[PDB]
Design a protein around this ligand. Sequence first.
Ligand code: CA
Ligand code: CA
Ligand code: CA
Ligand code: ZN
Ligand code: ZN
Length: 228
Amino acid sequence: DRQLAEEYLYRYGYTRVAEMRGESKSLGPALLLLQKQLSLPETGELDSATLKAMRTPRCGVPDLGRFQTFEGDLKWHHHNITYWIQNYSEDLPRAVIDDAFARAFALWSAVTPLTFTRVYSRDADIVIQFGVAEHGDGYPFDGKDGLLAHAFPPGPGIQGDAHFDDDELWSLGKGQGYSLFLVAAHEFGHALGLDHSSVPEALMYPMYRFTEGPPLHKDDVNGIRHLY
Ligand SMILES: [Ca+2]
Ligand SMILES: [Ca+2]
Ligand SMILES: [Ca+2]
Ligand SMILES: [Zn+2]
Ligand SMILES: [Zn+2]
């Protein structure tokens, strides 16, 4: 359990922030940062709630800090965001996958001055890929469960892109599997410039939770209103 906690705190940025605070050795300061960021009781202990959180499938984007240094100011500076579905999981029919991505974009288009347009080339702003383990960007996926997907903030090249771990069973969240619609809606939030939310019910909260309700909450809508 201590191994899992050390890796989780490293991967998602908590260990680095604790180091920058001289805090540095014991796991406690980093755990407190994680509890604050995930809205868990702030105990500073590797307790049952925190271990349960660390074991929950989630987005692979860091919570504090970023994957790397990125180019530009991390928002788009044009209004018609193009996207390319580069490949497909075989878990769902192609038409269902296409429609899941279109619906996830429709969530954001209603609450932003952006439009989303499907294209068929690498020139797209948002390139959408399914992959497993190392899949071409040096941020490898991890097999079944754990990390589900990740995305990159607006900008050139890999920036704006969204990747889905095809070692997950992709469905619409009914019966078995993870909802491609919900995870895509979350990842497209990053591809527009949003970070994770600390509100557990918000779409941009990092842990996966299935819901049949409307995916956007106030924190998500106000996040994108406070960007564009
Ligand atoms: Ca597949
Ligand atoms: Ca891109
Ligand atoms: Ca995974
Ligand atoms: Zn995320
Ligand atoms: Zn990737």
